């Protein structure tokens, strides 16, 4: 399981979901994360507006807004739900980038997400059973 592949495939899906095209055991994790992110986004929007509208995204502030939100997300701890929240948040930034006519920002966001996965989330993930444990945990929620 390679974290850069995981990020690129997730972002690709999030964008194709919106009508935007953007350039097997491992397949199981991608497909599971797909459904978990869609389920997260459904629950989120039931309680809140479309996340996209509460961003105030600009090319100048994009990295600082990414780092501030993600730092606070994981400040008091990690769990699989917060990791799912991290992937959806990064997907929303990518989607909003395309919407607001800054599509090259997507490539930076994907890099920031890979960096954060490799540098700050890799330890908890490995200590907690790896991605196979996410697949195991999310199993009964698949539809």
């Amino acid at each position: 399981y390679d974290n850069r592949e995981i990020v690129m495939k997730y972002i690709h899906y999030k964008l194709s979901q919106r009508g935007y095209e953007w350039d097997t055991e491992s397949e199981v994790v991608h497909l599971t994360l797909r459904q978990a992110g869609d389920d997260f986004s459904r629950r989120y929007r039931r309680d809140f507006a479309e996340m996209s509208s509460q961003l105030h995204l600009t090319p100048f502030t994009a990295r600082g807004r990414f780092a501030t939100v993600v730092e606070e997300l994981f400040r008091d701890g990690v769990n699989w739900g917060r990791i799912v929240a991290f992937f959806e948040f990064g997907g929303v930034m990518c989607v909003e980038s395309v919407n607001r006519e800054m599509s090259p920002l997507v490539d930076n966001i994907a890099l920031w997400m890979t960096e954060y996965l490799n540098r700050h989330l890799h330890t908890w993930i490995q200590d907690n059973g790896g991605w196979d444990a996410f697949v195991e945990l999310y199993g009964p929620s698949m539809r």
Partner: peptide, 22 residues
Amino acid sequence: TMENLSRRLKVTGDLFDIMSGQ
């Protein structure tokens, strides 16, 4: 408002974590 966004993400994430975990 980035704090507002982060706390909304965390609450949904923890909810998601509780629900999918039994």
